[PDB]
C-alpha cells in the first residue's frame, strides 16, 4: 500500500483469500468491512501515527465509531485483486469522517463505496465530547481541505435516520456472545462482529436468493466482551429492505440499531 | 505465491494484518491456521485442481481433516511478513498428509511447523475408506517421492493419542454456535473454528501470562451450522492441557485435543 502523491489519501490492494467468501465464491461484507479497517490503520501509520493526535493523547481521547455506511455493486471473487482508497476529513466540532473506495484491479471501475462517522470520548469516563480547536488543526495536516465524498449525492442512504424497530420482531437470533476471535488487540470487540450478529437474525432464504447491497449501522453502545446479544429483525419492504435492531439479552439495552437493503439475484 | 523449483512445494507470503493479531501484536493462532488453508489452497489450485484426484470427483470422494499439529515458537508481530512452505504426501492406503513451514521473511529463521492428516470419504454417505492404487498414483505427480516431514523426530508431540476428558471438566465454555462468518464457501463449518472453541475454555488468566506453543486436534465429527457445542478443558501438568468439544444437548462427541502453553 501507498499514500497518493498529493499525500492526502491511501491506497492498497488485496487477493481475495479462500477462506474470506461465502457461496457465491465472493468476499463476505464482513471480509469487506476488515479490508476497510485494514487500509484505514495503514494510512493512519503511513502519516505518522500509533489517529488519535498528539493532542487527543495528552487528554485522554479516542475516536470511536458513531455510523457506517456500506455500498457493494459487485463483491470481488476468490483470487480476485481489490484496490482500496481511503481517506480522512474534520466535520468542523462534530467529530470526523472515514471513506473508502473500492474498485476491480483489472477494470479499474468501482465496485463499492464506504463512508464512517467517528466522534471523540474519554476513554476513562466515556463521555463524549465535541472536537477542539487544536485537536482539529492537527487532523487538517492529512485531510484534504475541500470536501471529497464517497456519498456526494444531496439526498444519499448514508444520512438517512434510523428508527427502533419495535417488539415483537419479525425474526430474531438469540444468545450471541463473542469469542476471542471477535476481539481486536486492544480486547474491545472488533466494530465487524455487529455487522455479522445483525446479518445472523436475516433468513437463509433471503441470503440464498439475494445480494446485500447496501447496509447502514448506528452504534449506541458497546458491547463487552462478557456481554450476551439478540439479533432482531422486521422486514420493511426486486429489492428487500429490512430494519435491525442488536440488544443486550437479558435487560434489554440497545446496542446498535441499523437496516439492509438486498437486492434479488 | 509461487510453486518452488521441482514442482512439489509452493510458498507464499503474507503480511499480518491489524484484525488478525491478539492483546500481544502478534497473528492468534486462528489467523496462522487460517494462513495455512489459504496457502494449501493456492498449492492445490497451482498444481491443477484450479485437490480431489480426477477418479475421486467420478467416485463421489472427498478429503476430510483426521488431525491437525500446529508448533510455533514466535508469532508474527502487525505488519510483518511470514512465509509460509506447504507440500503434500501420500500415506499408502491410510490418506494423506499436508505439512507447513513457517519462516519469518526478514531472518529466514523457522518459526512454526504444521502438520495435518487427511482420510478419503464419501460425500453421500459419509463412509470412510482406504485410498485405492488409482487415487495414489494420481495424488504421487505432485507430491515428493521420498519422506519430507515436518516433525521428522522418531516419537514426536504430532503421533501422540489423546484420552477422552472425564466428567467433570476443570472449566468448560458452553452454548457455543457457528455463525456466517465461521462458514466455508460450501457452507461447511471452518476447521479453524474448532480451533476458536478449544481455547474459549482456557481461563484468560493462562492467555494472559503464557504463550501458546503447541496445540493438537483429533477431528471426530463434523458440527452442523445449527448445532451448539460446549467446550471443555482440563489441566494436565509449562502448562498442559486436555481438551473436549461435543454437542450440548446429548453430549456427542466432536473433537479432542491437547495443548501445550510456555510462560512469558
Ligand atoms: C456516552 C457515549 O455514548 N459514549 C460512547 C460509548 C461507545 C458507544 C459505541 C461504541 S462502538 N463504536 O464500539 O459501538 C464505542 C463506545
Ligand atoms: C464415518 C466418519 O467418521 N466419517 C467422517 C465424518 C467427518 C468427521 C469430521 C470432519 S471435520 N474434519 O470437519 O472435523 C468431517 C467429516
Not at 475541500?146 to 415483537?168: G, H, Q, V, W, Y
Amino acid at each position: 500500500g501507498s499514500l497518493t502523491e498529493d499525500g492526502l489519501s491511501y491506497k492498497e490492494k488485496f487477493v481475495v483469500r479462500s477462506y474470506e467468501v461465502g457461496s457465491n465464491k465472493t468476499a463476505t461484507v464482513e471480509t469487506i468491512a476488515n479490508l476497510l479497517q485494514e487500509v484505514g490503520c495503514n494510512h493512519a501509520q503511513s502519516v505518522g501515527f500509533s489517529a488519535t493526535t498528539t493532542t487527543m493523547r495528552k487528554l485522554h481521547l479516542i475516536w470511536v465509531t458513531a455510523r457506517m455506511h456500506i455500498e457493494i455493486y459487485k463483491y470481488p471473487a476468490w483470487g480476485d485483486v481489490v484496490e482500496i482508497e481511503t481517506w480522512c476529513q474534520s466535520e468542523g466540532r462534530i467529530g470526523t469522517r472515514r471513506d473508502w473506495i473500492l474498485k476491480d484491479s483489472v477494470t479499474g471501475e468501482v465496485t463499492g463505496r464506504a463512508t464512517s462517522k467517528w466522534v471523540m470520548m474519554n476513554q476513562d469516563t466515556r463521555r463524549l465530547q465535541k472536537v477542539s480547536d487544536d485537536v482539529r488543526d492537527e487532523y487538517l495536516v492529512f485531510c484534504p481541505q475541500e470536501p471529497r465524498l464517497a456519498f456526494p449525492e444531496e439526498n444519499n442512504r448514508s444520512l438517512k435516520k434510523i428508527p427502533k424497530l419495535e417488539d415483537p420482531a419479525q425474526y430474531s437470533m438469540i444468545g450471541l456472545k463473542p469469542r476471542r476471535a471477535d476481539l481486536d488487540m486492544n480486547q474491545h470487540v472488533n466494530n465487524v462482529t455487529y455487522i455479522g450478529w445483525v446479518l445472523e437474525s436475516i433468513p437463509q432464504e433471503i441470503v440464498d436468493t439475494h445480494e446485500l447491497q447496501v447496509i447502514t449501522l448506528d452504534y449506541r453502545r458497546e458491547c463487552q466482551q462478557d456481554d450476551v446479544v439478540d439479533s432482531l429483525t422486521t422486514t420493511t419492504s426486486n429489492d428487500s429492505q429490512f430494519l435491525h435492531l442488536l440488544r443486550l439479552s437479558g435487560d434489554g439495552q440497545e446496542i446498535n440499531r441499523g437496516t439492509t437493503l438486498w437486492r434479488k439475484k
